[PDB]
């Protein structure tokens, strides 16, 4: 059970310089602590500016990997969205944030001797939360920190909390007087041989909220030192006036076409348990979901536990509560 | 606080004679409760065979109304899918129960008196779940059933429980002994001028969750007399061989298309609190999300509680919680 | 140029189904297409009263399908990725009644079984014919049922046949409007079968290889067709200021994402042959079908060229059989 | 017939950016066309290193969009539906990085402000041009950069400009295929006013509206081009058994859905002039953009016919600007 902070982390009231106002420096990201997961063939790196601070978290998969991806929001920034890629790169900077994902494959690239064969396309997909009302100048991932990110990547590790993209990722956007400062997350599990890895940057506009029902990140009302449901604000305003989350679940299971793009469908729909409101106009939500081809599901569906018990709806749940557990990471 | 019942339902172990086997009348449903509401220019009318048990519910709204589609799920079973309704038709049977929605269309046809100009055409969108495997018969939702939901259409009712579309819904299907029966639900709100109804039936994969987070109906282990989340078998399942819900939420609050559509999204994926898991490949899940188009939103969406908080999001996350206390009373 | 055949003006007014004892009648209309398709029936019904009908494609196997809903006025139901058979009907939202039809008698067929992989499935969509006639009868449970039991093994009714009952094209003016009908086409390549099956309703007109327009926007003044565009620039000149559903039905083994871009490119190919096409006036929607009975080869040589055989090889196949099939319709 | 521009034979092995000190060259293609669209600004710009190229459409107060990605094979970035800019670019997915140079360098004329309502928004989308030529170099940060300072308002450049600096077309064989090129053509029409840009790179060939094929796929042994069709359907029966980026832009206002709708149409209307079209292994993408000046009359009528004013008739008007387009393209 993860020891979510009650502590308030309030993002504070909303131009200031651009990148080259500075002399950035990638800063290879540590977070508040390391994950450690056993999964090869999949690397994370996480790099940021002190100077936004902003950041940008790359999921390297150098043999490249299927995906789908399932781009559910109203604001979605997002680049490539290929159904095939070598590596997912998430990052602050909103639309401008997407320039990071440029540098990945820039450097991707130079690693293959600038070989340019249709087979040889280094293929990188990117999406980017809008992080500038939590702070005060208007530096964003740029190419130079997507390549830093790519050069941090180390097998079996992940930064928690302020780090990468979730640098100045924040929750709770009713008002920003109660917005408070998320993180990235991640959080993961081997069942047998399979292996499934959840990574998150939540800047909903909604709130963080645990497996009990209780808001634990974003809407703190500075007034109550308490965190109330958006829903309750929502209708409060009503009464008196009338009259961004993206993320990545990687998996290790075979899944066709058809099946991986429903389990993304699934697992990004789960989120709306731990997020809330989740999927509006306003969010540019993004899920890539992503199988290395490793292992097949049984033909058969059956088991002691029921005839439908194995397959790829089953490893849908399962990875929704990783998902879950990496949203209360970020939180934490 | 809706007060489930939690004595079991359990569906049974899954031909039988099909509709011409009988002579079919159709029975106007009223369910174990009726809902009263307040919302004029929409009615709600629900009938069903009881040689199925069988049935369908149909949304009257002969002014037309403004509607998105939400084909969420990978099962879908759908007829029109229109972006402007007259009504909308929701029934068992499968795929052979889209059958009434032709029933609804031939009977409005009849009203205009057979007239057949374009701004005349009556435009109705059908839904069904897959109700069989709760029932020894073959008997569907035909045209004469969904002619007689339409003219059992009242304003201002809805039958909670078994009846019409949820005769034979049946939820968490691990395995089917462990299914039970649902319902059809309801739940209704007005604040200030702005109505909210919510119409579910839920069939779903998974299993009806309730606000605290217990399971309330669906998989249900007669051997414990207790109902498990369906991640507990999913991950026992897969540690020993490795190695649908049909809804409606309508409002008069006018929304453009865009928002309208991106709304339709947020409550149904907000339904994954409720329904768990949700959206998956085995599920047909679809939503319709219909305004009436009666009363503006403010054109800023400031208040006493926040800059942000009076606008279509905001609106998606009330609605939303009238939809769980639907998916509540379905359950109940 | 071929001889007008004007729909003449909308007469709104009529007599729906219940005014009539509604006789399906098996179509033939003015010529029979012969071919070898095996595993593939097609059936056509209509009722005179109307005049409107239906034309169902059955695949007693079942096949994979892909479906591309282009238009801004679809009518569709099911729009399923494994159908036992395809309904294209006349008579608008109200023709979609046609496929229940079919699904009914289905079920019946299978002895009533309901197991979750013994489902019969059947997409339909329409096209609004009442603007070509003068009553309100739509094809109704009974006549999709009909067109079912009317199906054969390699025959096609050409022309004013099934859903071509009262197919029109060209719709700048009603005035100007024609008859089409329905159509097909079959091509077969060594093993490799292409079944082309099509009801023009379009807004826009039909035009052939060489660019002419060949039926719709006649003008009966000028004993001339007109491209759409010519009437519209002029319109816009002047004051500012002051659908067609289809089946492309295969026996090559394509997985769901590869028929999936073969039903948009044969789609979109068709605006070679209708023009405009893809409106927002149209409800335009293909169906993608294969028996999955043969394989491409692993790599895609040949003495032709070295990306020769594929699946957008076959997309550019198929499109000139169903451009073949618009002016069967049209002709 | 035009004079053949065959690519020749893919030569890979080549220096990537790194090896040069890369030197932007404003793009002015074989000719300048001219044209009067206030608030919408065009800027090309190439590196001959390559040779590869971006092209940026500026518009400077921000315009509605709707996008039309139609391949297998798209390679996008933003699909944004409000835009101050677009961004077509050569050197396949490492081109997008053009597009972030245009966002980088709007930020800056905006002082670097970033209110919800003031980001700089650009949509890019790419073709790959790598095997038209024998190096690595693509479009890079300071390409789309100096392509958005090179731009003015009411000019092109026409042919090898821009993103169209080594775009080919006629795929089925590379010893076929032929250099294209970028093009663009404007029609008023009272205070109507409609823009094509295009950059065509297709795995088909471009076809004139008599039908010929007039650039791709052409065969040096006869001095012939063909139809990839007559390829395709020949390498069948020997075997079985044995992208285009665009943007139409216009000041009539449309809603989202007709946008949308409109841009859907246009592209469609493309396979008559590109064979085959919207094809797997194409990336096609379209963006329709409105600067939502001028308004549609209420109701459609006019002497040319009673539904002759709307979207879709500017469907169709525009669907012939960008025809023009393509052929200028090809040119
Ligand atoms: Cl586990
Ligand atoms: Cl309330
Ligand atoms: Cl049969
Ligand atoms: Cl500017």
Redesign the interface.
């Given at each position: 059970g993860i020891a979510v902070d009650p502590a308030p982390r309030l993002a504070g009231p909303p131009?200031?310089?651009?990148?080259d106002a500075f002399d950035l420096a990638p800063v290879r990201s540590t977070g508040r602590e390391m994950l450690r997961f056993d999964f090869p063939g999949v690397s994370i790196g996480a790099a940021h500016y002190e100077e936004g601070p902003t950041g940008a978290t790359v999921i390297h998969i150098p043999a490249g990997a299927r995906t789908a991806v399932d781009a559910?929001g109203?604001a979605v920034?997002?680049?490539?969205?290929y159904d095939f890629n070598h590596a997912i790169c998430l990052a602050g900077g909103?639309?401008?944030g997407?320039?990071a994902?440029?540098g990945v494959?820039?450097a991707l690239?130079?690693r293959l001797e600038?070989?340019?064969?249709?087979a040889e396309?280094?293929?990188?997909s990117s999406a980017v939360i809008?992080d500038?009302?939590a702070r005060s100048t208007?530096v964003y991932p740029?190419?130079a920190l997507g390549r830093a990110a790519l050069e941090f990547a180390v097998p079996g590790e992940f930064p928690q909390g302020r780090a990468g993209a979730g640098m100045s990722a924040s929750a709770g956007?009713?008002?920003?007087?109660?917005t408070e400062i998320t993180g990235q997350g991640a959080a993961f599990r081997r069942?047998?041989?399979?292996r499934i890895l959840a990574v998150v940057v939540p800047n909903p506009?909604?709130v963080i909220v645990d497996?009990?029902?209780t808001v634990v990140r974003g809407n703190y009302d500075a007034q109550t030192g308490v965190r109330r449901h958006?829903?309750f604000?929502?209708?409060?305003?009503?009464?008196?006036?009338?009259?961004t989350t993206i993320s990545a679940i990687v998996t290790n299971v075979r899944m066709?076409?058809?099946?991986l793009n429903?389990?993304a469908?699934?697992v990004?729909?789960?989120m709306?348990?731990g997020i809330?409101?989740?999927?509006?106009?306003?969010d540019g939500d993004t899920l890539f979901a992503v199988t290395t081809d490793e292992?097949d599901?049984?033909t058969t569906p059956?088991?002691?536990?029921?005839?439908?018990?194995?397959?790829?709806?089953?490893?849908?749940?399962?990875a929704?509560?990783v998902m879950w557990d990496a949203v209360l990471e970020a939180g934490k």
């Open positions: 131009g200031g310089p651009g990148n559910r109203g920034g997002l680049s490539g969205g909103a639309g401008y997407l320039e994902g440029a494959s820039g690239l130079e600038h070989r340019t064969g249709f396309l280094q293929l990188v809008y500038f009302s208007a740029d190419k956007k009713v008002d920003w007087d109660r069942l047998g041989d399979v506009v909604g497996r009990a029902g958006p829903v604000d929502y209708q409060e305003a009503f009464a008196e006036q009338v009259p066709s076409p058809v099946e429903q389990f469908k699934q990004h729909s789960s709306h348990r809330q409101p989740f999927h509006t106009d306003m292992i599901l049984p059956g088991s002691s536990r029921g005839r439908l018990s194995v397959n790829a709806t089953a490893l849908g749940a399962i929704s509560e």
